[PDB]
A paper describes a structure:
The octameric fraction was further used for structural studies. The structure of enolase in the apo state was determined using both cryoEM and X-ray crystallography. Freezing of apo–MtEno and PEP–MtEno at 3.5 mg ml−1 was accomplished with glow discharged Quantifoil holey carbon grids (R 0.6/1, Au 300 mesh) and a Vitrobot Mark IV set at 100% humidity and 16°C, with blotting for 3.5 s. Both the apo and the PEP–enolase data were collected in the Titan Krios at the National CryoEM facility, Bangalore, with a Falcon 3 detector in counting mode at 1.07 Å pixel−1 sampling with images exposed for 60 s, with a total accumulated dose of ∼27.70 e− Å−2 and dose fractionated into 25 frames, with each frame having a dose of ∼1.1 e− Å−2. Particles were extracted with a box size of 320 pixels and subjected to two rounds of 2D classification followed by 3D auto-refinement, per particle CTF refinement, B-factor weighting with Bayesian polishing and refinement, and subsequent 3D classification in RELION-3.0 with D4 symmetry imposed. The nominal resolutions of apo–MtEno and PEP–MtEno were 3.1 and 3.2 Å respectively.
Residue numbers in the entry:
A (entry chain C), B (entry chain B), C (entry chain A), D (entry chain H): 1 to 423
Write the structure that this text describes.
Amino acid sequence: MPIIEQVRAREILDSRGNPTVEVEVALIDGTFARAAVPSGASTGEHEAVELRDGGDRYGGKGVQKAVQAVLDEIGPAVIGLNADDQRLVDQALVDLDGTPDKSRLGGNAILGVSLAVAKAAADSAELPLFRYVGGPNAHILPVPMMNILNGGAHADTAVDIQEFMVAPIGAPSFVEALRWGAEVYHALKSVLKKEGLSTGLGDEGGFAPDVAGTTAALDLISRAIESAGLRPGADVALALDAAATEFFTDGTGYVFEGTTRTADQMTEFYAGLLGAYPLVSIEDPLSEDDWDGWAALTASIGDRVQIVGDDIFVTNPERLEEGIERGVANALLVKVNQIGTLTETLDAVTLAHHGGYRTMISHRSGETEDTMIADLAVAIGSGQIKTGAPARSERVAKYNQLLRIEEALGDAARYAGDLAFPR
Amino acid sequence: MPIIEQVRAREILDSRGNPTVEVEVALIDGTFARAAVPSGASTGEHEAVELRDGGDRYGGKGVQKAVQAVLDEIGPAVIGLNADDQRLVDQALVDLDGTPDKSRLGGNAILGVSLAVAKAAADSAELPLFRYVGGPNAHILPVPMMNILNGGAHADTAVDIQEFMVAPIGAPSFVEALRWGAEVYHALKSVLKKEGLSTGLGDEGGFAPDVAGTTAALDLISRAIESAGLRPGADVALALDAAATEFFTDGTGYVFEGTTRTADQMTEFYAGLLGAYPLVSIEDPLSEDDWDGWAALTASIGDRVQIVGDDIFVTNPERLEEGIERGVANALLVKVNQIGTLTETLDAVTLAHHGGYRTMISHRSGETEDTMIADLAVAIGSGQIKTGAPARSERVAKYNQLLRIEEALGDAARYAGDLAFPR
Amino acid sequence: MPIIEQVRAREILDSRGNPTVEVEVALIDGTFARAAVPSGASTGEHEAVELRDGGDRYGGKGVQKAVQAVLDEIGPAVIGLNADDQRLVDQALVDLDGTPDKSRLGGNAILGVSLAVAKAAADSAELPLFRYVGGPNAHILPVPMMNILNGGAHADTAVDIQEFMVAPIGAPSFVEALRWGAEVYHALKSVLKKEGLSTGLGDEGGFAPDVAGTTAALDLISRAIESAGLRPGADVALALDAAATEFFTDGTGYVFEGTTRTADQMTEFYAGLLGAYPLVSIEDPLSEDDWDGWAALTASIGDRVQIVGDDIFVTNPERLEEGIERGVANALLVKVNQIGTLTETLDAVTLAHHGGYRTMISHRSGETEDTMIADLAVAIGSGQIKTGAPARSERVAKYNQLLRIEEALGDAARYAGDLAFPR
Amino acid sequence: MPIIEQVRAREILDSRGNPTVEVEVALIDGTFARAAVPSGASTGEHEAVELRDGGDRYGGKGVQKAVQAVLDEIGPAVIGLNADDQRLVDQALVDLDGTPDKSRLGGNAILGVSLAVAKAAADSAELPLFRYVGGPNAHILPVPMMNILNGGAHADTAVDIQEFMVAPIGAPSFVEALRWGAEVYHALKSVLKKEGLSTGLGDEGGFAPDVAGTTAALDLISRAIESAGLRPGADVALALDAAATEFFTDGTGYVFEGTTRTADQMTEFYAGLLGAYPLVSIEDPLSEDDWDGWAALTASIGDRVQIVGDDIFVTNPERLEEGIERGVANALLVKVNQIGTLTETLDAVTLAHHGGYRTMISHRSGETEDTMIADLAVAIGSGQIKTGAPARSERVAKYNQLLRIEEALGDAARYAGDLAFPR
């Protein structure tokens, strides 16, 4: 029977050296799962909050309090519920907390118990996690968007765009897409030296070069794609993560390249980009409060490229409906710990699917060796995933799990290449 | 293990007294599931065809050779595959047939094996058939659309619309919706008798009264809703199945009630109805091939009411993509035996979900005691179902299974009442 | 072991849209059963009464009270008893009620538990339900008496005979008997349309057209048997359900065809019928209390035809003995919910077998998808069954179960054709 | 599963010191049953034939041939069939033999395999043999007819009535009936010992002293009933086994008491006996070929007493129907080894039940420690049994098994006292 028997959390380190929670939900059979909770650099005004300790131990980022919360309250508050009733246990937790942010118990503890009971309600039925969460029709492997060149708010250099990404949309299978991504990565690693630059990896495995400007960055990436042995656009596309809030001074314009600009000027810059490069997707092109500018930019360049809402929505359905109404952001970005539980992620991704919006399962800055977002991007059939460059094995664990998923499917699997970027 | 061991097939009678196929896929453990294949009154030009015997036995509708196809070819052609691989087994069947409409082996000998395999890839995992096919987030109970008054191509009457339906959209739960539907049904049964009419049940349990004109029928239905104790629009809505192909003389026009009309006139009729009555959905309003007329009518009234494509699309993805891009019919009916497999069913419903189209799991004229379409309407989360009037227990078995589903969910269940008809 | 662990009831809809009880009796060794209780409208004075709610819900036909009788009282009153002791559990229930007609707990809340434990005292021994109740020698498949024409108290028509039935007594097996019945039923659907009559199905799937007198109806049936490809008498016989109580005015006489008659006149009408048509059985020829007229009728025609007591007995043994004494009809209908338990059913059928009376398992007006009476008609070896026309799959589910039974027996099965009607 | 795996046969001694066959059937599911075949001396022309060895070993009564027939031919001919399919295996045996008497393989070997298969099927279902062979409604305990006074063809005495039996019809339960029978037996033993008469037990444990005549014998029995403390007729009744064939010279007449007389005078003697004594049953009152005399006697006294056909029928259905039609012998005597299988036994007892005839499971002269006929008399619900006096533990094993059956039933059991002898 899939009824929870024990729950116990411990405190571990994430990929950045900061503590995080790890929950281990056992079942009355012997099914013993384990799920670690990722954590972002910060938190806006609408996400679920992490319950950090605060003080001097671990730089004020200890999670002994969330561990204690799991071990004292969340433990017996679910022991005895039905594992396969994800909508039972998740509402149980959300009411046990009682706040709109899960502040009393922290989003990290709630999410840890949610994910571990899901991994036990998939281990129980002997299904694999992607098959359980997605059913029988879970067969699509996503297009990996590999952030190879970092800039903007990361390396404090002359670049303003945050993440430059490549996407092997032309591959025949997923394993060839992973090969092409790794080859473009290792080609850029040498183009940097052949242009006198540095090879210091950021937090996603991407590079931190001191290149002139945005256009120079895209040109460097295109040179690396050509040097790999591929054809830009037909084999490998490009993508952007503008992260506009990092350079938008409220009351003034966006400060880009050393000039103050309006939303119209940024839209003109994006149109000039869409011109000379095979861009398929831009993420957070304007600030998360400039709804009118977002509608303007969506109407202007929203038929030729994907528009991802990373900050303007925080995987909250209540803001997603509003953004659907005003005609902004034809794509969502699903981060599992910005909403706090599996069920709410599934509901938000449903709501964004039935509105004409593509979704994209995404990673956090501090990840672990947990490979659940791979299974989750296969299950919901998003056809896109954003989980870093092929380096820093907290990013590569996801790609390895997707390889195993494809191998386990076999003839059933399908690579979602070029069916995920019609524009 | 979920590996098929033994497959059998026999010939049984459907709800109308015609033969049909019943398959019994067995697993190595002992999992033993049976599934009967429904069948429509006629097989069109894009469906999968049924492999009838032909001749003089059973009026030429015997299925003794679709029973033989399962026992001589399909049995060993699937024995040994993996149950949880719906994609695998369904592609195996589709290639073993080798035709664009499954004619060599019949679109009934294959669907039986598909379904009875899915009823064991869910019986094995000990999940219930609705939790398997839809995952963990399968919680939405659909709005029953009850066909209480039949007309048009069903009986000799001056009525031109095929099926008049009621929909209890204002109920708090599903069980109260079923109660309201049954009460409206009995109220109408009393009203017809009190107004000197007949109570002869059709093939769906709906009535065949000798009333004059469409408007009088909607008025009778509103009077029955009032007499039941409810209020139209706030508690119970209305719906239509025009089935207008049944009176469109090609090159002449939609001749009905003694008036030859163009596509424009039918739109005016529908606008008047939508104004004077609380309609929420009209099904097949114009014709199977009048694409331009469909685009016109969708532009005219296609945002104040639901437009269901029953015949213009045949649950075929290839025609569905065309109807999407041409902007017609923001809804479709999902009849499982017009496509041939469970897999292609899920694929078409996905393709129509991601296009802004609501779906509606529907029944056939000849059904059986098989209650699979209930489990399937709650798994895909359609939020609508069309399975006849609360009579003729081949139609009530579905409602009983939905009651059991709602009871098995518990507090997790949600009734999709009023959140399926925004217009 | 076969010891009852849980019992739980719910409220579902029957084939006519009225509520009924559905009980589920789990055992310790898994063995989860369910059994729905049928319910007929025409309740007399000696049967067990149904515990309806009364009020405004469901038109006063709710059964929320009988669902409580099972969940609060009947549940623990049997939890712990032995399943294979039908006598034990059924006497337990009959004493726990304490009334001569089970009125305190309802003759529907009790029969559900009886039938469900009998379905678990066979699912336990892994025997099939027909083999358990009848032992090792349960091998006889019954002749189906298919009701194809409805008249009398059913529709506005000049006929006073209630049900006109055909019986394929000349078939080699049961499958061919079902085929011949379905073919006659589909032939009559044309002979009606080929004479300007209506095809509105009643409550048993039989037609309710406007014909002139009994003789014209029997002639239509003979024409349909001829048009099917068979020959009357040698292949298909005839049967009658004279519901003569429906036209007997106490103290005035049987008003038949518009001419007041006495018992002698009705006997003369029956004797004239026995000449021109191959009738094999008539049920309820005169009335419930007209004992003297019956003993006078079972002597004039009681040698050349079967006389079935449908209302003169209500499956009550106490009435059945006194009927055996007075030289009254030589057959009875076994309706399981007019007596209240399986045990008393078996006892009454035993008492009527040894008296030289043939039996006939029969259906109710409101049935469900429960196919128990098929197993019961095979087990007791009645050699006759009356379960409606081959339509309305609440009636066809029984025939499908009899087909499954016949192929599960194998070479052991025997069709009781023409050995059930010696006269 | 209930599929036969091994069949063995050995040669043992019966209660009289003659060899007989014992068959042991081992199922594939561990079940291991053992059954021994009784054998009587007096064999007519229609019973099954016992396959004896013939020669000088064991006086020509060896059964090594039947043992070898089971071990070489029947074993593999049934190994693999389904236990619960009694009719399957029994038709298999009857065709494997190929003769109308089973003489090629002997009725004893076939019956041994049949009975051991039934015992293993009952042991498999975990039901006890009476519950299996009778179903759920097997609850009636039979009235033991105890043969206490032997005469006629058994010893040198002036009596022509073969068996004098007492029947405790007035007991409240079965255990009190057995007590009353044993007490009457010991009282008669004392009454005989007082009169210097012989106390040498026959083959049934009953005495055979040199009494004057039939009337003196019945008077001695009545004295013994009075001396026990009971009331003749109200507590204990009487019964006869005349076996008139043992004193009917064909063409001369029944030489009774030393006065040759016709059937009419024998009927007069029986009428006088019935008048002056509480006789409830007479067995074989006339010869087994004098059908007309039997009809005369049945008309004369055949409603004031039970007329048991022991030799006029040999448990053969084909002779039973002929005796039914001519109005003779309103009772049957079921000996299991005169027909050859359990299936044909059940069929003949059914045929005699549905004709107004009571049945009576009976024993043979050479019995064994096998107590199967007790279970069989409970299962078929005969309400009578004839298995000797309470002595000679091959007769008492049956009564002990009936005690255990009653104890296992418990509150469900019913003693068929005084309900089995209306007249």
